[PDB]
């Protein structure tokens, strides 16, 4: 009976493979051949931020496009003013091992988490002129890998227990739990509408979830190893992923299939971070070789290189206005490029 | 061309920097270690000298100061500990059935790409249990390991007074297999320090201080260009 059900499962997978083959009329390469090339893109370091005394694991940009937050294993979180390179605040953390940080859209709160298995919220604006912890959220049985804020009272988190959750900050409890991965979850991205999100895991698969009904609409496959990074295209109808097999791939939600792969023979190291420009023409990635490569999304050709670090590049970000890019490293420094 | 309020903000930033520098100086006075074990090891009782995601212990010997971490809450989280002074690995010598599983785990840690420059201290626990099984003669290491029968204890090897020849051949045999993996891979970068221990033994903390003194000395010879 168990074996009989296993045969039924394979039959359904066979039907799924046939349907996506029928929709493969053409390739992205044959449609975009006539388009003229982007050119050569050269960028320079415009600012260097110094203060952390240990490797940096995460960073996030404010909606204003002038203020940013960074997290390091020295047990400290810092808020910076990019234009004047001044430090607005420094926050002491109870546990040294932190793997994630987030900035609220309102600008009134920040969040951090790690091997402690807890996500903590901090109130930036209060009388008494100090920053204090507001709530601590507990319930996950594995390390916290990523966290993002839907609103002042809503946050989504990912974990190494193979599960994701949505929380109510005032109550301190989880409204919904999303389950179905067989491997640790490493990354999360939220759509512009805020009605859907995508996740990537060590099982080499990515899933799309609906926030209101707690269900998995579609599953995507193709990579040969763990996926460490995920991002959403500006329209909201496509997404990009990066893995330790040294390749990056682009997927389309409506077609339900991979459109293109970005790879070169010289590159043999893994990819740690991914981001897109405001138009979506350029894709930016970070590598363990200490260098960041720029790619033309439409034609899959490398256009530039931005290398300024003596250790592994761990994080990347682009401003909402589109003016600048920020990078972080295990060398203890952050740089701004334009 | 500069505002009064802008000058005051810059003064606040300089004061924040002074506090961060002072906190960093406090860290260079302390040494950090990671504990790894398989649950039949008895790893928790190793340091009798002093005392969900992560657990910690603190102890001090001869004015130097030490902190130990156990993540009992491994491929992805081991990247964080690439700057620790040393890693402590514990095994139960008496269990013949689980010995091969322990050997495979050690090989993965020794050959990991983020732990290339980190040295390992190996503790072989339950040495009292091994002695009674060897003397009793009901259980034979030869059944689990075929090459043991064609083994002779090293000619220059010396054992503690009173220990039977049989125990000396068996103890030396189990120590040799782990040292073999260490010699085979990384060279000129890392050494394994092997010790045999029992639950009652109270000298474990002194042994760790001695091994760290060797680790710092070897790095200084490299920094000064002598070697």
């Amino acid at each position, epitope marked *: 009976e168990l074996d009989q059900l296993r045969q039924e499962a394979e039959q359904l997978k066979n039907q799924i493979r046939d349907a996506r083959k029928a929709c493969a009329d053409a390739t992205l390469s044959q449609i975009t051949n006539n388009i003229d090339p982007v050119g050569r893109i050269q960028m320079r370091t415009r600012r260097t931020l110094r203060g952390h005394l240990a490797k940096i694991y995460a960073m996030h940009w404010g909606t204003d496009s002038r203020l940013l937050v960074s997290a390091s294993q020295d047990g400290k979180l810092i808020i910076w003013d990019s234009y004047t390179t001044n430090k607005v*605040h420094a926050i002491p953390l109870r546990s040294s091992w932190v793997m994630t940080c987030a900035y609220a859209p309102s600008g009134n709160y920040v969040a951090c988490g790690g091997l402690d298995n807890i996500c903590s919220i901090y109130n930036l604006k209060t*009388r*008494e*002129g100090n920053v204090r912890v507001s709530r601590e959220l507990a319930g996950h049985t594995g390390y916290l890998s990523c966290c993002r804020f839907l609103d002042d009272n809503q946050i989504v988190t990912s974990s190494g227990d193979t599960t994701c959750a949505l929380w109510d900050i005032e109550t301190g409890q989880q409204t919904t739990t999303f389950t179905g991965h067989t491997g640790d979850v490493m990354s999360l991205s939220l759509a512009p509408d805020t009605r859907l999100f995508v996740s990537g895991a060590c099982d080499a698969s990515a899933k799309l979830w609906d926030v209101r009904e707690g269900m998995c609409r579609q599953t995507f496959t193709g990579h040969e190893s763990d996926i460490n990074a995920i991002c959403f295209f500006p329209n909201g109808n496509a997404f990009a992923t990066g893995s330790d097999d040294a390749t990056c791939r682009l997927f389309d939600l409506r077609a339900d299939q991979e459109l293109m792969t970005y790879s070169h023979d010289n590159i043999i190291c893994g990819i740690t971070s991914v981001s897109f420009s405001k138009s979506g023409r350029l894709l930016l990635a970070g590598y363990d070789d200490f260098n960041c490569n720029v790619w033309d999304a439409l034609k899959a050709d490398r256009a530039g290189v931005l290398a300024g670090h003596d250790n592994r590049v761990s994080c990347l970000g682009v401003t909402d206005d589109g003016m600048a890019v920020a990078t972080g490293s295990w060398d203890s420094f952050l740089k701004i490029w334009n | 061309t500069v505002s009064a309020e802008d000058k005051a903000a810059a003064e606040r930033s300089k004061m924040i920097d002074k506090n961060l520098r002072e906190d960093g100086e406090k860290a260079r006075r302390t040494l950090r270690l990671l504990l790894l074990g398989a649950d039949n090891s008895g790893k928790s009782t190793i340091v009798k000298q002093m005392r969900s995601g992560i657990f910690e212990t603190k102890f001090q010997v001869d004015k130097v100061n030490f902190h130990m971490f156990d993540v009992g809450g491994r491929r992805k989280w081991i990247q964080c500990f690439n700057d620790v002074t040393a890693i402590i690995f514990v095994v139960d010598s008496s269990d013949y059935n689980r010995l091969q599983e322990a050997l495979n785990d050690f090989k993965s840690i020794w050959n990991n790409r983020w732990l290339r420059t980190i040295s390992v201290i190996l503790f072989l626990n339950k040495q009292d249990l091994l002695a009674e099984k060897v003397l009793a003669g009901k259980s034979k290491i030869e059944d689990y390991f075929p090459e043991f029968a064609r083994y002779t204890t090293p000619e220059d090897a010396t054992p503690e007074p009173g220990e039977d020849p049989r125990v000396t051949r068996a103890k030396y045999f189990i120590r040799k297999e782990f040292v073999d993996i260490s010699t085979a891979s990384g060279d000129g970068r890392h050494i394994c320090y092997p010790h045999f221990t029992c639950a009652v033994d109270t000298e474990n903390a002194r042994r760790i201080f001695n091994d760290c003194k060797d680790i710092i000395l070897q790095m200084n010879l490299r920094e000064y260009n002598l070697v």
Partner: single-chain antibody
Framework: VQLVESGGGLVQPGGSRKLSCSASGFAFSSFGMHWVRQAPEKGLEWVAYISSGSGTIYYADTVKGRFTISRDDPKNTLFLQMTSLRSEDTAMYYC??????????????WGQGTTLTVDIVMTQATSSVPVTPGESVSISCRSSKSLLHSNGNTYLYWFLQRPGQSPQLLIYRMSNLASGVPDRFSGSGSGTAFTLTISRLEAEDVGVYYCMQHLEYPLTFGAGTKLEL
């Protein structure tokens, strides 16, 4: 948050006295502190400033050479030593707290005050405007030099003193509104000309309104305008 001040009384001319302020409910060390005085029937005038960390100290020309400012961070106290007193020194003195960082609101809290008995020019021409409940009013301030800076910020502040009490911040940096303040109040202007508009006037809006500049030291204030029913 509370600031309480003591040390005041009749003094003969040529004498000396020390005034003290005690702070509670907030982090005293992280905030810069100032002093201001109001003459018997006149308006607000600034006296001195001490920075957090005690790095920067500034003084008005009239009191320079005869007054000193100090702070004790462990005991949460601030002091003013005054020497060679003259008749012009009679007034009421107040303690004010200020913090400076991107997006901060300076001059937020003021103490009750103690009584002792012994440059950019800002002009608000109207001295009195009669008002009725339920109507909209506008108040205007003019400046000798433009308050707009190349950074893109214009530095002008508005305050209200209702009868029998200390001054309260209403607007900072021309357009921003302070916390705990009703949305009826609004501020607009250009370098050298500024306006504050109050809609749906109600009782409790009666008092004297003042304009101040923070572009450069010394800090200066306008004479004030009174709204009366």
């Amino acid at each position: 948050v509370q600031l309480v001040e003591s040390g005041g009384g009749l003094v003969q001319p040529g004498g000396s006295r020390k005034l003290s302020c005690s702070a509670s409910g907030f982090a005293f060390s992280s905030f810069g502190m100032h002093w201001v005085r109001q003459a018997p029937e006149k308006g607000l005038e600034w006296v001195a400033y001490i920075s957090s960390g005690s790095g920067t100290i500034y003084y008005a020309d009239t009191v320079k050479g005869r007054f000193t400012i100090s702070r004790d961070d462990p005991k949460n106290t601030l002091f003013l030593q005054m020497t060679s007193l003259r008749s012009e020194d009679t007034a009421m003195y107040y303690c004010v707290r200020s913090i400076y960082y991107y997006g901060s609101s300076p001059f937020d809290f003021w103490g009750q005050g103690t009584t002792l008995t012994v440059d950019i020019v800002m002009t608000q021409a109207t001295s009195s405007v009669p008002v009725t409940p339920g109507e909209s009013v506008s108040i205007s301030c003019r400046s000798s030099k433009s308050l707009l800076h190349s950074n893109g910020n214009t530095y002008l502040y508005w305050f209200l003193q209702r009868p029998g009490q200390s001054p309260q911040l209403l607007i900072y940096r021309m357009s921003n509104l302070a916390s705990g303040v009703p949305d009826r109040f609004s501020g607009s202007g250009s370098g050298t000309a500024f306006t504050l508009t109050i809609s749906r006037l109600e009782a409790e809006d009666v008092g004297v309104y003042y304009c101040m500049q923070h572009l450069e030291y010394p800090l200066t204030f306008g004479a004030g305008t009174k709204l009366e029913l």
